[PDB]
Amino acid sequence: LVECLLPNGMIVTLECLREATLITIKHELFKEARKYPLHQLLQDESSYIFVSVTQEAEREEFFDETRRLCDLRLFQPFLKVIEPVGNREEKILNREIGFAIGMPVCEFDMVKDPEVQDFRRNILNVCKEAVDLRDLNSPHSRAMYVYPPNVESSPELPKHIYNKLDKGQIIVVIWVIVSPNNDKQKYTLKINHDCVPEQVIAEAIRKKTGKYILKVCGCDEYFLEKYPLSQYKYIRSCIMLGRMPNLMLMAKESLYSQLPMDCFTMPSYSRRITSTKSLWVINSALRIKILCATYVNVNIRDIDKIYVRTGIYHGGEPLCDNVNTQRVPCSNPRWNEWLNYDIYIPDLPRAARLCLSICSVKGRKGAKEEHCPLAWGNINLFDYTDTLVSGKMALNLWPVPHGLEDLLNPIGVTGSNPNKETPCLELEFDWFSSVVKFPDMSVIEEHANWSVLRENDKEQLKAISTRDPLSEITEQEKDFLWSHRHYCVTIPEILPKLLLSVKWNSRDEVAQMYCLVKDWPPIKPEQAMELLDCNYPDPMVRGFAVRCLEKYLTDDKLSQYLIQLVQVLKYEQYLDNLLVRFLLKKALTNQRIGHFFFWHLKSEMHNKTVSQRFGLLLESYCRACGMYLKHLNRQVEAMEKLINLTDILKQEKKDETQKVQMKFLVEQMRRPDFMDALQGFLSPLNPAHQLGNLRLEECRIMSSAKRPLWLNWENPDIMSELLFQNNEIIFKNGDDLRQDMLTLQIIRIMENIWQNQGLDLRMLPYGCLSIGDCVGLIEVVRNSHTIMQIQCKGGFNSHTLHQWLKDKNKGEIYDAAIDLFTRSCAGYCVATFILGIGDRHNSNIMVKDDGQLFHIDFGHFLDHKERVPFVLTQDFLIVISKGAQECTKTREFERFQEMCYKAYLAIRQHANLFINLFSMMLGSGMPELQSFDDIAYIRKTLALDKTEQEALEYFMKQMNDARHGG
């Protein structure tokens, strides 16, 4: 039953079914109005729509009558009938964008803050300069956007890959399914490895006797750019494994006819729109008043006093001493006390803040006054328009991040807790009779041009420029660097050191650095990513560390370094900065970046501290992505179904056995609405694979800790047998998956260095992705068994893994299932040591099909942080020494230890890059990566205080202690 509200003061009770559309509910509505009094003042069915409130408490109107009843998400079943209002399709697009990003677009109009409202109208030329670039030369330019080249940054090959090419010749299979009755004429060619994709096809037509495009059979990847064929990550990865690259020639127009022409229209808000003193003229200290705390939640008979501790910081470091207030009683928290600071007004840096808090003094135990914070909150001192805050101000206070004992939280976010049932705190800043700005960059390069021969110790500059970012720095060195600042422009990789030496609470230091960064030579983007963590908050530093990404970072590396470039947006202070104009101009020219751009932002919209600047950033992507918003909506509705179905298992069916639960699952999945959302959509783990028809016989509930969910799809491609022919995925609801997403990204960056050295160690960094709050997707690997399963079958003995792996393959190939168990049992030991991983046993070690030695389950890696030594169990030695009885002196593993030594070193010549990725992740909110005290163990396993030859001896001692260590 639905209650309609007619346009003439009537009310009709209409019986409904839960699949009716808006037409069958509306066109039948006006035929029911005949038997009610004022039926002649009504109008025809046209020129009327509905309106109602939804789960999100929105006053939405329904221009799209093709939607059905259950698809609306109403609050109670009522309706209303009016005439339309507004633009017709704009109201349809604003409902799409609001379903993708998880919150209404109308919410961002009830925000009065003038900062939120100039981002929305000025960001729209980054969303427009992209769309005038993805569509410059069509249809070709539109083609590269949707299917972009998946290439590698380095054209030339390692030496252990050029060997497998006899005279630089590749063998490729060019399928041609061009028979009108879908018959296939496979070919075979012998061509070079430096051949462009318009010559592989230019000669496969003279074999047969133009205007075509290649494609990876099974997963529709395309070769559209004129590169060397060996540079693609498919060709380049077949020459490694010695497999055969299966291509399939296709026609252009069969591709261009799946590229629907989409357009971008400026939104509604596109068109809705004196006497200043510089900061260098004021003469006063810095004084801040503290009126009162609106209310705080502390017990009466336990806490005695409370006070408000404050401080003036510049990116983690205090610019002066910390000040307190008097200890008022619990009941009457009012201070009204001006606090004074020993900082001088023209000596405030552009990125200064105010970090305050409210602590409690238990005491009553000798001189042991044990202080404990109750809340915290930060605020900028300047404004996004360069204007010092001068007035009164309120501020709601966040909760203390539980696990943190410090009395201030300098690393948190600057803003007010949007919740309103929180302890408030009124402040008041000092009026200077007008607006006080910040000087422009032309009155700052004169204060330094006004306050203004080789040597023999150039070796100490080099000795410091090549140091660890977590290494010591002494007072003698900071003055040595700053004094020799006009020669550090020949050693450009020293700039992260020359900036921790300058003192930011004095405006002659800072005024001279700005004229020095303005001419600094560019750095490698592997090094200009240190200048974006929580230690370099100035806006001229961070605008140097972004002109280096924009001309030295490639789309290969950006795709690898994108989980950290989305965490250093939380370290920003304003909203319309230069890091967001870069990561948005990229997501709007490459749907591979935009796919993970979306899901990384969307995965953490549930967190209230970041939930307003991401939402403003999603909304700007979803409005200019184009045709790809339709696919993202179909992916979001699929996960929504899965989250719901799993909740019922976790709450209602959480007490009977698995018999009833597996039948309820097939009972729920066989349902004709669950079955229509879970089919025919791309994959969140990889946008190039496309899921298909589900398999109810394949899907099952797993007996793991949380009881996750197994799911099996089918490849809907016409050559899915050549590549794999099933997509299998795990779905987890209740376990955080950011600890592993970062563990598997290190393993994938380790293996990429080894491959370019010439060491052919082989890892398997499978896919992982967190979609929301404690919910994510775990990729499954085909034809692999855990060591526990392989050995429990063969019933204690230590030759079971060698007997099993010998049975499963034998003959001329037995010298490859032992070469591969060794090229991968070494890599996963020079990696589970460098990262202090000690949670390893049978059930989380897996050997794949031909002896590849695969590690899994990087989730409880922590929860106890002497140290973690090493493993090298005995039965993995027998497989290395070819089953010989005595493995300790075998000749085969002496080239085994020789290749663990070459590995440990190459990960030690790249220890800075690994340091600059755990430090970009400190304000992420992960409970075990908070301060630099946790990235300390990297320096104890890589031996960074020692020297190189002393480092190697540290690791040889580590192996031998576990080679026979128990």
Partner: protein
């Protein structure tokens, strides 16, 4: 003389990490200091860390040709000499921007005497009495934290339903005033023929509208009953944590001060996990 050996310098610590000096100069008055061995391990460098106004300054002690100091002219005998020279002189001699005197040395015999039960027989029993409670503040604090983070999840839902009823109830009242516009002149004043249809047409339609507009207001007023009952209990469990968190900080200073006084300095045991 005043030149002693640094083995008995109470302010001397020697071989400890940078990450334990940070929580010894945390929120302490200026002129607090200690000396420890360098991390590069040249056997005799002895870096110095100074707390001058929030930051932890770190100063190098060079050791050329049996002399000590900060600058090139190393002209002192021992570190106990160089440290005592600056416990009564200002550091502005070396650094014009470092006018601080080494006032408060971080001793180590200060807390080693605070321990009680001199005999080791009471050390293992005064220890098991302080690990049963710290392992109880663990459970007692997380039993009252999920209950906190959970109830915060409920208030945000109930607080959103009220914006639902405040919209619905406003969609009905916007019709009663537009109903009255028509019902006065189009169908009842014009139909003055003593007919009873108005008792069935408007009298039976305007009644169900008024039985609905108030029917919804009885559930908004009802929803706020548990929201007020829940927002009040959300403060009662937020107050219980504050009476537990500081006491959860003291028992971590009493176990560790009993796991070091004799449990390790008296013996280098792997027997740690049975005497707790």
């Amino acid at each position: 003389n005043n030149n002693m050996s640094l083995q008995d310098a109470e302010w001397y610590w020697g071989d400890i990490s940078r990450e334990e000096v940070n929580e010894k100069l945390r929120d302490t008055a200026d002129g607090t200091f200690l000396v420890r061995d360098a991390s590069t391990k040249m056997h005799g460098d002895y870096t110095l860390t100074l707390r001058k106004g929030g930051n932890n300054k770190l100063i190098k002690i060079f050791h050329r040709d049996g002399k000590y100091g900060f600058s090139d002219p190393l002209t002192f005998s021992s570190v106990v000499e160089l440290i005592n020279h600056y416990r009564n002189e200002s550091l502005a001699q070396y650094n014009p921007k470092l006018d601080v005197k080494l006032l408060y040395p971080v001793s180590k015999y200060q807390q080693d005497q605070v321990v009680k039960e001199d005999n080791i027989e009471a050390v293992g029993k005064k220890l098991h009495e302080y690990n049963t409670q710290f392992q109880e503040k663990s459970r007692e604090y997380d039993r009252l934290y999920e209950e906190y983070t959970r109830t915060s999840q409920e208030i945000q839902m109930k607080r959103t339903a009220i914006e639902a009823f405040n919209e619905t109830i406003k969609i009905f009242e916007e019709q009663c005033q537009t109903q009255e516009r028509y019902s006065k002149e189009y169908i009842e004043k014009f139909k003055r023929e003593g007919n009873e249809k108005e008792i069935q047409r408007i009298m039976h339609n305007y009644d169900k509208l008024k039985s609905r507009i108030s029917e919804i207001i009885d559930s908004r007023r009802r929803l706020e009953e548990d929201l007020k009952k829940q927002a009040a209990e959300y403060r009662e469990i937020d107050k219980r944590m504050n009476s537990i968190k500081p006491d959860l900080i003291q028992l971590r200073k009493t176990r560790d001060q009993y796991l070091m006084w004799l449990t390790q300095k008296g013996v280098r045991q792997k027997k740690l996990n049975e005497w707790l």
